[PDB]
């Protein structure tokens, strides 16, 4: 009943009164409830069709914020409704005005009035935030936004000139990070700009002493992946993820225990969390360098070199430290995510026989440190998380796929992972149980302690004897682990455990059981597990013959 | 530039944590 008469004014033919109302609705649309009523009376329709194209720049700044605020307070869909109403054109036209104001030499920007200047920033802030929101909405909106050259060139102009207020600067980087995430066109836009040289400006800033260096790394990493500027195919001046890693690592160097918060702290969301998340993405995306490299002293792999020598030491430090506070509870978590992604990618390499020897010597000692300094301390205090339990087992599984029973036996870790499996009993292959099977299986290969092998082997086989309630994926992993371990009659454990404890009978007994559960899996929902299980029974049959043939 | 991968590498891309 207060807002009803406010809106009438917005359509008033007296520019003074409309422009005032706009002012008030931008505040009033903040509190909930006043916003439900404001949206039902056609606020979005007026603002779009009248207020954003009004002649007065105070009116247009309120218009944009009314949309900004609404976009923020509303659910994600509200943006699609905005997209459909063609807000993007409104934004593009307004964007083209900011640039004309910013890049004009007639009036010209620095010679504007203080209050006049502040208004151009208001409008930019509303624009920036909006673009950010719609790009997050759906893939089509993302590719509609990225299409708009005016929008892009606005972004390059802001990042490049560095005259904008910092809150505007950071929002512009944020935007371009989202726009550039797995988007080829944007990456080409950034690297093809001879007008403002955003790419050069970004490089210089991502490499130097500036406080916002990591922020520029987040943009550049996205560009390097999208354009496949990688170790096999370096970008401009040998550019690839390699050059971002030291900056990203010097960012972890500064975070030390006992200083969570301050009176003035402009770096914490950006400075620390961003660096970790990006290191972990770098971990993920290096996997694509290995695949693409193949279709065509880690000197040839600088990204991998930097990851191991520089990135990983700081991540083991960060994984270790408390944890005094919830915020450092998140630093640990993210540190563990990066270790995880790197360790996993690396373990996606063939190291059997002599294969990839160069990379195996680079990694192996580090893999041992990760296990002793990270995985083991954390495993020492049983309680209490499931989320965290799950994170350490994933990493342990990645590190033990390379270590292969060379992996340290210290706190008898296999027994802990084994107890983890059973107790956490209370996409098939992402089960934590699968993870328990795979790590314990991997550290039990030769040349491990023959009793460590006996336990692990007994657990794996028990799994089959009592397959009555084990999830089919966990059966497949168990069978692969066993084949992986006891398929060599020269290994002490083949005679010392496989034969000594007659593993062969359980395997021969399990064959029928294994055929019915396989056919129990819908090929059509879902394929992978089915075809994977078919290979395990296949291998299971071939495995029961080969030994059958050996005392 | 050729580095031999594991037999079923894509099976393991699920263990990457994304952002």
Coordinates of C-alpha atoms in Angstrom, one line a residue:
Chain A
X1 CA 0.0 0.0 0.0
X2 CA 3.1 2.3 0.2
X3 CA 4.6 1.1 -3.1
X4 CA 1.4 1.3 -5.2
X5 CA 1.7 5.1 -5.7
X6 CA 5.5 5.0 -6.1
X7 CA 5.3 3.2 -9.4
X8 CA 2.7 5.6 -10.9
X9 CA 5.4 8.2 -10.6
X10 CA 7.9 6.2 -12.6
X11 CA 5.7 6.6 -15.6
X12 CA 5.0 10.3 -14.8
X13 CA 5.5 12.7 -17.8
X14 CA 7.5 14.9 -15.4
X15 CA 11.1 13.7 -15.8
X16 CA 11.9 15.0 -12.3
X17 CA 9.3 12.8 -10.6
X18 CA 10.0 9.6 -12.6
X19 CA 13.7 10.0 -12.0
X20 CA 13.0 10.3 -8.2
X21 CA 10.7 7.3 -8.1
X22 CA 13.4 5.2 -9.8
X23 CA 15.6 6.2 -7.0
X24 CA 13.2 4.9 -4.3
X25 CA 12.3 1.6 -6.0
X26 CA 15.9 0.7 -6.3
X27 CA 16.0 0.8 -2.4
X28 CA 12.6 -0.6 -1.9
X29 CA 13.1 -3.5 -4.2
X30 CA 15.7 -4.6 -1.7
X31 CA 13.5 -5.9 1.1
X32 CA 11.6 -9.0 0.2
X33 CA 7.8 -8.7 0.0
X34 CA 7.9 -5.1 -1.2
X35 CA 9.5 -6.9 -4.2
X36 CA 6.8 -9.4 -4.7
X37 CA 4.3 -6.5 -5.0
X38 CA 6.7 -4.5 -7.1
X39 CA 7.2 -7.3 -9.6
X40 CA 3.5 -8.1 -10.0
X41 CA 2.8 -4.4 -10.8
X42 CA 4.9 -4.3 -13.9
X43 CA 8.2 -2.9 -12.6
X44 CA 10.5 -5.0 -14.8
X45 CA 8.4 -4.0 -17.8
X46 CA 8.6 -0.2 -17.1
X47 CA 12.3 -0.2 -16.2
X48 CA 13.2 -2.1 -19.4
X49 CA 11.0 0.0 -21.7
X50 CA 11.0 3.5 -20.2
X51 CA 13.6 4.0 -17.5
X52 CA 16.7 2.5 -19.0
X53 CA 16.3 4.7 -22.1
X54 CA 15.3 7.9 -20.2
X55 CA 17.3 11.0 -20.9
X56 CA 18.5 11.6 -17.4
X57 CA 21.5 9.5 -16.2
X58 CA 20.2 9.3 -12.6
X59 CA 17.1 7.5 -13.9
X60 CA 19.1 5.0 -15.9
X61 CA 21.5 4.3 -13.0
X62 CA 18.5 3.4 -10.7
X63 CA 16.9 1.4 -13.5
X64 CA 20.0 -0.8 -13.8
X65 CA 20.2 -1.3 -10.1
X66 CA 16.5 -2.2 -9.8
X67 CA 17.3 -4.9 -12.3
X68 CA 20.7 -5.7 -10.6
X69 CA 19.0 -6.0 -7.2
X70 CA 16.1 -8.1 -8.6
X71 CA 18.6 -10.4 -10.4
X72 CA 20.4 -10.9 -7.1
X73 CA 17.5 -11.4 -4.8
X74 CA 15.7 -13.6 -7.3
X75 CA 16.2 -17.3 -8.1
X76 CA 18.5 -18.1 -11.1
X77 CA 15.6 -18.5 -13.5
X78 CA 14.5 -14.9 -13.1
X79 CA 17.5 -14.2 -15.3
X80 CA 16.2 -16.4 -18.2
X81 CA 13.0 -14.4 -18.1
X82 CA 15.2 -11.4 -18.3
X83 CA 17.1 -13.0 -21.2
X84 CA 13.9 -13.7 -23.1
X85 CA 12.7 -10.0 -22.5
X86 CA 15.9 -9.0 -24.4
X87 CA 17.7 -7.4 -21.4
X88 CA 20.9 -8.4 -23.2
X89 CA 20.3 -5.8 -25.9
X90 CA 19.5 -3.1 -23.3
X91 CA 22.8 -4.1 -21.7
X92 CA 24.8 -4.0 -25.0
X93 CA 23.4 -0.6 -25.9
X94 CA 24.3 0.8 -22.4
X95 CA 27.6 -0.9 -22.5
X96 CA 28.3 0.9 -25.8
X97 CA 27.6 4.2 -23.9
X98 CA 30.0 3.5 -21.1
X99 CA 32.7 2.9 -23.6
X100 CA 31.9 6.2 -25.5
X101 CA 32.0 8.0 -22.2
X102 CA 35.1 6.2 -21.0
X103 CA 37.0 6.5 -24.4
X104 CA 35.7 9.8 -25.6
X105 CA 38.1 12.8 -25.7
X106 CA 35.5 15.4 -26.3
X107 CA 33.8 15.8 -22.9
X108 CA 36.2 13.5 -21.9
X109 CA 36.2 11.0 -19.0
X110 CA 38.8 12.3 -16.5
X111 CA 37.4 15.9 -16.9
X112 CA 33.8 14.8 -15.8
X113 CA 32.2 15.9 -12.6
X114 CA 33.0 13.8 -9.5
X115 CA 29.3 12.9 -9.1
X116 CA 29.0 12.5 -12.9
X117 CA 31.9 10.1 -12.8
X118 CA 30.6 8.1 -9.9
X119 CA 27.4 7.5 -11.9
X120 CA 29.2 6.0 -14.9
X121 CA 30.7 3.5 -12.3
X122 CA 27.2 2.7 -10.8
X123 CA 25.9 1.8 -14.2
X124 CA 29.0 -0.3 -15.0
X125 CA 28.7 -2.1 -11.7
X126 CA 25.1 -3.0 -12.5
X127 CA 26.0 -4.1 -16.0
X128 CA 28.9 -6.2 -14.9
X129 CA 27.0 -7.9 -12.2
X130 CA 24.1 -8.6 -14.6
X131 CA 26.3 -10.1 -17.4
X132 CA 27.9 -12.3 -14.7
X133 CA 24.5 -13.6 -13.7
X134 CA 23.1 -14.4 -17.1
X135 CA 26.3 -16.1 -18.2
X136 CA 25.9 -18.4 -15.3
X137 CA 22.2 -19.0 -16.2
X138 CA 22.4 -21.4 -19.2
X139 CA 24.7 -22.4 -22.0
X140 CA 22.7 -20.5 -24.6
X141 CA 22.7 -17.3 -22.5
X142 CA 26.4 -17.8 -22.0
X143 CA 27.0 -18.0 -25.8
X144 CA 24.7 -15.1 -26.4
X145 CA 26.6 -12.9 -24.1
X146 CA 30.0 -14.0 -25.5
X147 CA 28.7 -13.1 -28.9
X148 CA 28.3 -9.5 -28.1
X149 CA 31.5 -7.6 -29.1
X150 CA 30.4 -4.5 -27.3
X151 CA 30.2 -6.4 -24.1
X152 CA 33.6 -8.0 -24.7
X153 CA 35.4 -4.8 -25.7
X154 CA 33.9 -3.1 -22.6
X155 CA 35.6 -5.7 -20.5
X156 CA 39.0 -5.4 -22.2
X157 CA 38.8 -1.6 -21.9
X158 CA 38.2 -1.9 -18.1
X159 CA 40.9 -4.5 -17.3
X160 CA 43.4 -2.9 -19.7
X161 CA 43.1 0.8 -18.7
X162 CA 43.1 0.1 -14.9
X163 CA 41.4 3.5 -14.1
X164 CA 38.2 1.9 -12.7
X165 CA 37.4 1.7 -9.0
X166 CA 38.7 -1.6 -7.6
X167 CA 35.2 -3.1 -7.0
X168 CA 34.5 -2.5 -10.7
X169 CA 37.9 -3.9 -11.7
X170 CA 37.4 -7.1 -9.8
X171 CA 33.9 -7.6 -11.0
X172 CA 35.2 -7.2 -14.6
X173 CA 37.8 -9.9 -14.1
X174 CA 35.2 -12.0 -12.4
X175 CA 33.0 -11.7 -15.4
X176 CA 35.7 -12.5 -17.9
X177 CA 36.7 -15.5 -15.9
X178 CA 33.2 -16.9 -16.2
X179 CA 32.8 -15.9 -19.9
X180 CA 36.2 -17.3 -20.7
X181 CA 35.7 -20.7 -18.9
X182 CA 35.6 -23.3 -21.7
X183 CA 34.6 -20.9 -24.4
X184 CA 36.8 -20.8 -27.5
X185 CA 35.5 -17.6 -29.0
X186 CA 36.3 -15.6 -25.8
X187 CA 39.7 -17.0 -25.7
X188 CA 40.3 -15.9 -29.2
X189 CA 38.7 -12.6 -28.4
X190 CA 41.2 -12.0 -25.6
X191 CA 44.2 -13.1 -27.5
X192 CA 43.2 -11.4 -30.8
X193 CA 42.7 -8.0 -29.4
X194 CA 45.1 -5.5 -30.9
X195 CA 43.1 -2.6 -29.6
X196 CA 43.6 -2.7 -25.8
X197 CA 45.9 -5.8 -25.5
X198 CA 44.0 -7.3 -22.7
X199 CA 46.1 -10.5 -23.1
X200 CA 49.4 -8.7 -22.6
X201 CA 48.0 -6.7 -19.6
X202 CA 46.7 -9.9 -18.1
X203 CA 50.1 -11.8 -18.6
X204 CA 52.1 -8.9 -17.1
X205 CA 49.7 -8.8 -14.1
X206 CA 49.6 -12.5 -13.6
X207 CA 53.3 -12.7 -13.4
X208 CA 54.3 -9.8 -11.3
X209 CA 54.1 -8.3 -7.8
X210 CA 50.6 -6.9 -8.1
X211 CA 48.1 -8.0 -5.4
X212 CA 45.6 -9.2 -8.0
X213 CA 48.0 -11.5 -9.8
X214 CA 46.1 -14.6 -9.0
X215 CA 42.9 -13.1 -10.4
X216 CA 44.5 -12.7 -13.7
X217 CA 45.7 -16.3 -13.5
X218 CA 42.1 -17.5 -13.3
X219 CA 41.3 -15.8 -16.5
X220 CA 44.5 -16.8 -18.3
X221 CA 44.2 -20.5 -17.2
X222 CA 40.7 -20.5 -18.8
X223 CA 42.2 -19.1 -22.0
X224 CA 45.0 -21.6 -22.1
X225 CA 42.7 -24.6 -21.9
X226 CA 40.1 -23.4 -24.3
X227 CA 42.7 -22.6 -27.0
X228 CA 44.8 -25.6 -26.2
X229 CA 47.8 -23.6 -25.3
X230 CA 49.5 -26.5 -23.7
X231 CA 52.9 -28.3 -23.3
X232 CA 52.7 -30.0 -26.7
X233 CA 51.4 -26.8 -28.3
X234 CA 52.5 -23.7 -26.4
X235 CA 50.8 -20.4 -26.8
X236 CA 52.3 -17.0 -27.7
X237 CA 55.9 -17.0 -26.4
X238 CA 55.6 -20.6 -25.1
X239 CA 52.6 -19.7 -23.0
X240 CA 50.8 -22.6 -21.3
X241 CA 49.7 -23.3 -17.7
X242 CA 53.4 -23.6 -16.8
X243 CA 53.8 -19.8 -16.4
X244 CA 50.9 -19.4 -14.0
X245 CA 52.0 -21.9 -11.4
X246 CA 54.7 -19.9 -9.5
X247 CA 52.4 -16.9 -9.0
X248 CA 49.7 -19.3 -7.8
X249 CA 52.2 -21.0 -5.5
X250 CA 53.6 -17.8 -4.0
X251 CA 49.9 -17.1 -3.1
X252 CA 49.8 -20.2 -0.8
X253 CA 53.2 -19.2 0.7
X254 CA 51.6 -16.3 2.5
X255 CA 48.7 -18.1 4.3
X256 CA 50.0 -19.2 7.7
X257 CA 48.1 -20.6 10.7
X258 CA 46.4 -18.3 13.2
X259 CA 45.4 -15.3 11.1
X260 CA 41.9 -15.9 9.6
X261 CA 40.5 -12.4 9.5
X262 CA 41.4 -8.7 9.8
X263 CA 39.9 -5.2 10.1
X264 CA 40.8 -4.6 6.5
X265 CA 41.2 -7.7 4.3
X266 CA 40.8 -7.3 0.5
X267 CA 42.4 -10.7 -0.5
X268 CA 40.9 -13.7 1.3
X269 CA 38.3 -14.9 -1.1
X270 CA 40.5 -14.0 -4.0
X271 CA 44.1 -14.5 -2.6
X272 CA 43.9 -18.0 -1.2
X273 CA 40.8 -19.9 -2.4
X274 CA 41.2 -18.8 -6.0
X275 CA 44.8 -20.0 -6.1
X276 CA 43.9 -23.5 -4.9
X277 CA 40.8 -23.9 -7.1
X278 CA 42.9 -22.9 -10.1
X279 CA 45.9 -25.1 -9.2
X280 CA 43.3 -28.0 -9.0
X281 CA 41.8 -27.1 -12.4
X282 CA 45.4 -27.0 -13.8
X283 CA 45.6 -30.5 -12.2
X284 CA 42.5 -31.6 -14.1
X285 CA 43.3 -30.1 -17.5
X286 CA 46.8 -31.3 -17.8
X287 CA 45.1 -34.6 -18.5
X288 CA 44.0 -33.2 -21.8
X289 CA 47.6 -32.3 -22.7
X290 CA 48.4 -36.0 -22.4
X291 CA 45.6 -37.1 -24.7
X292 CA 46.1 -34.4 -27.4
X293 CA 49.8 -34.7 -27.1
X294 CA 49.5 -38.3 -28.2
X295 CA 47.3 -37.5 -31.3
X296 CA 50.3 -35.6 -32.7
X297 CA 64.3 -33.2 -16.8
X298 CA 60.6 -32.7 -17.3
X299 CA 62.0 -30.1 -19.7
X300 CA 59.3 -31.1 -22.3
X301 CA 56.5 -30.9 -19.8
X302 CA 57.0 -27.6 -17.9
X303 CA 53.5 -27.5 -16.7
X304 CA 54.0 -30.9 -15.1
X305 CA 57.5 -30.0 -13.9
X306 CA 56.1 -26.8 -12.1
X307 CA 53.1 -28.8 -10.7
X308 CA 55.4 -31.3 -9.0
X309 CA 58.4 -29.2 -7.9
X310 CA 56.6 -26.0 -7.0
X311 CA 52.8 -26.5 -6.7
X312 CA 52.8 -29.7 -4.7
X313 CA 55.1 -28.8 -1.9
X314 CA 52.9 -25.8 -0.9
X315 CA 49.8 -28.0 -1.1
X316 CA 51.3 -30.6 1.3
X317 CA 52.0 -27.7 3.7
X318 CA 48.5 -26.4 3.5
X319 CA 47.0 -29.8 3.9
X320 CA 48.9 -30.3 7.2
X321 CA 48.2 -27.1 9.1
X322 CA 45.1 -26.7 11.3
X323 CA 42.2 -26.4 11.0
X324 CA 41.8 -24.3 14.1
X325 CA 38.8 -22.7 12.4
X326 CA 36.2 -23.6 9.8
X327 CA 37.8 -21.3 7.2
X328 CA 41.0 -23.3 7.4
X329 CA 38.8 -26.3 7.3
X330 CA 38.0 -25.2 3.7
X331 CA 41.7 -24.5 2.9
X332 CA 42.6 -28.0 3.8
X333 CA 39.7 -29.3 1.7
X334 CA 40.7 -27.3 -1.3
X335 CA 44.4 -28.2 -0.8
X336 CA 43.3 -31.9 -0.8
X337 CA 41.3 -31.3 -4.0
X338 CA 44.3 -30.1 -5.9
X339 CA 46.6 -32.9 -4.6
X340 CA 43.8 -35.2 -5.6
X341 CA 43.5 -34.0 -9.2
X342 CA 47.3 -33.9 -9.8
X343 CA 47.9 -37.3 -8.3
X344 CA 45.0 -38.8 -10.3
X345 CA 46.1 -37.3 -13.6
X346 CA 49.7 -38.5 -13.0
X347 CA 48.5 -42.0 -12.2
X348 CA 46.8 -42.0 -15.6
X349 CA 50.2 -42.7 -17.1
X350 CA 51.6 -46.1 -17.9
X351 CA 54.5 -46.8 -15.7
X352 CA 54.6 -50.6 -16.1
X353 CA 57.8 -52.0 -17.5
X354 CA 60.1 -49.1 -18.4
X355 CA 57.2 -46.9 -19.7
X356 CA 57.4 -43.2 -18.9
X357 CA 60.5 -43.5 -16.7
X358 CA 61.4 -39.8 -16.7
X359 CA 58.1 -38.8 -15.2
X360 CA 58.1 -41.8 -12.8
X361 CA 61.4 -40.6 -11.1
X362 CA 60.1 -37.1 -11.0
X363 CA 56.9 -38.2 -9.2
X364 CA 57.7 -41.2 -7.0
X365 CA 59.5 -39.5 -4.1
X366 CA 56.9 -36.8 -4.0
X367 CA 54.1 -39.4 -4.1
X368 CA 55.8 -40.9 -1.0
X369 CA 55.8 -37.6 0.7
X370 CA 52.1 -36.9 0.0
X371 CA 51.4 -40.3 1.6
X372 CA 53.6 -39.8 4.7
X373 CA 53.0 -36.1 5.3
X374 CA 49.4 -35.8 4.2
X375 CA 47.4 -39.0 3.9
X376 CA 48.9 -40.6 7.0
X377 CA 48.5 -37.9 9.7
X378 CA 44.9 -37.3 8.6
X379 CA 44.2 -41.0 8.8
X380 CA 45.7 -41.0 12.4
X381 CA 42.8 -39.1 13.9
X382 CA 39.8 -41.4 13.0
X383 CA 37.1 -38.9 13.6
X384 CA 34.8 -37.7 12.3
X385 CA 33.9 -36.5 8.7
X386 CA 32.6 -38.6 5.8
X387 CA 33.3 -35.8 3.3
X388 CA 36.9 -35.6 4.4
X389 CA 37.3 -39.4 4.8
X390 CA 36.2 -39.6 1.2
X391 CA 38.7 -37.0 0.1
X392 CA 41.8 -38.7 1.7
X393 CA 40.9 -42.1 0.3
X394 CA 40.5 -40.7 -3.2
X395 CA 44.0 -39.2 -2.9
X396 CA 45.5 -42.2 -1.3
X397 CA 44.0 -44.4 -4.1
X398 CA 45.7 -42.1 -6.7
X399 CA 49.1 -42.2 -4.9
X400 CA 49.0 -46.0 -4.4
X401 CA 48.3 -46.6 -8.1
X402 CA 51.8 -45.4 -8.8
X403 CA 53.5 -46.7 -5.5
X404 CA 52.2 -50.4 -5.9
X405 CA 53.2 -51.9 -2.6
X406 CA 56.3 -49.8 -2.5
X407 CA 53.8 -47.6 -0.8
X408 CA 54.7 -47.1 2.9
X409 CA 53.4 -49.6 5.4
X410 CA 53.6 -47.6 8.6
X411 CA 50.4 -47.2 10.6
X412 CA 49.2 -50.4 8.8
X413 CA 47.0 -48.1 6.6
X414 CA 45.3 -50.9 4.8
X415 CA 43.6 -51.9 8.1
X416 CA 42.2 -48.4 8.4
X417 CA 40.9 -48.2 4.8
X418 CA 39.5 -51.7 5.3
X419 CA 37.6 -50.6 8.4
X420 CA 36.5 -47.4 6.5
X421 CA 34.8 -49.6 3.9
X422 CA 32.7 -51.7 6.3
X423 CA 31.7 -48.7 8.5
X424 CA 30.7 -46.4 5.6
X425 CA 28.2 -49.2 5.0
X426 CA 25.1 -47.7 6.6
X427 CA 27.1 -43.1 -10.5
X428 CA 28.3 -46.7 -9.5
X429 CA 32.1 -46.1 -9.7
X430 CA 32.2 -43.0 -7.5
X431 CA 31.2 -44.9 -4.4
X432 CA 33.6 -44.5 -1.5
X433 CA 33.6 -48.3 -1.1
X434 CA 35.1 -48.6 -4.6
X435 CA 37.8 -46.2 -3.4
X436 CA 38.6 -48.3 -0.4
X437 CA 38.9 -51.5 -2.5
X438 CA 41.2 -49.8 -5.1
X439 CA 43.7 -48.2 -2.7
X440 CA 44.0 -51.2 -0.4
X441 CA 44.3 -53.4 -3.5
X442 CA 47.0 -51.2 -5.0
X443 CA 49.3 -51.2 -2.0
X444 CA 49.1 -54.9 -1.7
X445 CA 50.9 -55.7 -5.0
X446 CA 54.4 -57.0 -4.8
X447 CA 56.8 -56.3 -3.0
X448 CA 54.7 -55.5 -0.1
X449 CA 54.9 -57.2 3.4
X450 CA 53.6 -60.7 2.8
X451 CA 51.2 -60.3 5.8
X452 CA 49.9 -56.9 4.6
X453 CA 49.2 -58.7 1.3
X454 CA 47.5 -61.6 3.2
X455 CA 45.1 -59.3 4.9
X456 CA 44.2 -57.2 1.9
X457 CA 43.8 -60.4 -0.2
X458 CA 41.6 -62.0 2.4
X459 CA 39.4 -58.9 2.5
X460 CA 39.1 -58.8 -1.3
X461 CA 38.2 -62.5 -1.5
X462 CA 35.8 -62.3 1.5
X463 CA 34.0 -59.6 -0.6
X464 CA 33.2 -62.3 -3.2
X465 CA 32.3 -65.1 -0.7
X466 CA 29.8 -62.6 0.7
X467 CA 29.0 -60.9 -2.6
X468 CA 25.4 -61.3 -1.6
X469 CA 25.1 -57.6 -0.9
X470 CA 28.1 -55.9 -2.4
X471 CA 27.4 -53.2 -5.1
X472 CA 28.3 -54.5 -8.6
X473 CA 30.9 -51.8 -9.1
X474 CA 32.7 -52.9 -6.0
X475 CA 32.7 -56.5 -7.3
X476 CA 34.3 -55.4 -10.5
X477 CA 37.0 -53.4 -8.7
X478 CA 37.7 -56.3 -6.3
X479 CA 38.1 -58.7 -9.3
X480 CA 40.5 -56.3 -11.1
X481 CA 42.6 -55.8 -8.0
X482 CA 42.9 -59.5 -7.5
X483 CA 43.9 -60.2 -11.1
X484 CA 46.3 -57.3 -10.7
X485 CA 48.0 -58.9 -7.7
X486 CA 48.2 -62.6 -8.0
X487 CA 48.8 -63.1 -11.7
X488 CA 52.5 -63.8 -11.4
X489 CA 53.7 -67.2 -10.0
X490 CA 57.2 -65.8 -9.3
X491 CA 55.8 -63.4 -6.6
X492 CA 56.2 -64.8 -3.1
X493 CA 52.5 -63.9 -2.4
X494 CA 51.2 -66.1 -5.2
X495 CA 52.4 -69.2 -3.3
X496 CA 52.5 -67.6 0.2
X497 CA 48.9 -66.4 0.1
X498 CA 47.0 -67.2 -3.0
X499 CA 47.8 -70.9 -2.8
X500 CA 48.5 -71.3 0.9
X501 CA 45.0 -70.0 1.6
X502 CA 43.3 -71.6 -1.4
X503 CA 42.0 -68.4 -2.9
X504 CA 41.4 -70.5 -6.0
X505 CA 38.3 -72.3 -4.7
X506 CA 36.4 -69.1 -3.8
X507 CA 37.2 -67.9 -7.3
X508 CA 35.9 -71.1 -9.0
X509 CA 32.9 -70.9 -6.7
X510 CA 32.3 -67.2 -7.5
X511 CA 32.3 -67.7 -11.3
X512 CA 28.6 -68.8 -11.5
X513 CA 27.6 -66.0 -9.0
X514 CA 29.5 -63.5 -11.1
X515 CA 27.7 -64.5 -14.3
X516 CA 24.2 -63.8 -13.0
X517 CA 25.0 -60.4 -11.5
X518 CA 26.6 -59.3 -14.7
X519 CA 23.5 -60.2 -16.7
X520 CA 21.6 -58.4 -13.9
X521 CA 23.0 -55.1 -15.1
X522 CA 20.9 -53.1 -17.6
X523 CA 23.2 -52.6 -20.7
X524 CA 20.9 -49.7 -21.5
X525 CA 20.8 -48.1 -18.1
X526 CA 23.8 -47.9 -17.6
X527 CA 26.2 -49.2 -20.3
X528 CA 29.8 -48.7 -18.8
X529 CA 29.3 -50.8 -15.6
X530 CA 27.8 -53.6 -17.8
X531 CA 30.6 -53.7 -20.3
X532 CA 33.2 -53.3 -17.5
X533 CA 31.6 -56.3 -15.7
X534 CA 31.6 -58.3 -18.8
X535 CA 35.4 -57.9 -19.1
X536 CA 35.8 -58.9 -15.4
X537 CA 34.0 -62.2 -15.8
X538 CA 35.9 -62.7 -19.0
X539 CA 39.1 -62.1 -17.2
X540 CA 37.8 -64.1 -14.2
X541 CA 37.4 -67.2 -16.5
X542 CA 40.8 -66.8 -18.1
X543 CA 42.2 -66.3 -14.6
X544 CA 40.7 -69.5 -13.2
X545 CA 42.4 -71.4 -16.0
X546 CA 45.9 -70.0 -15.9
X547 CA 46.6 -70.8 -12.3
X548 CA 44.5 -74.0 -12.5
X549 CA 47.5 -74.9 -14.6
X550 CA 50.1 -74.0 -11.9
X551 CA 50.8 -75.9 -8.6
Chain B
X1 CA 55.2 -35.7 -27.1
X2 CA 53.8 -39.3 -26.8
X3 CA 53.3 -40.6 -23.3
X4 CA 51.6 -43.9 -22.9
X5 CA 48.3 -43.7 -21.0
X6 CA 46.7 -46.3 -18.8
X7 CA 44.5 -48.8 -20.6
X8 CA 41.2 -47.2 -19.6
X9 CA 42.1 -43.7 -18.7
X10 CA 38.7 -42.1 -19.2
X11 CA 37.4 -44.4 -16.5
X12 CA 39.4 -42.3 -14.0
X13 CA 38.3 -38.8 -15.1
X14 CA 35.4 -39.1 -12.6
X15 CA 37.8 -38.7 -9.7
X16 CA 38.7 -35.2 -10.7
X17 CA 37.1 -32.6 -8.5
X18 CA 35.7 -29.8 -10.6
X19 CA 34.9 -26.1 -10.2

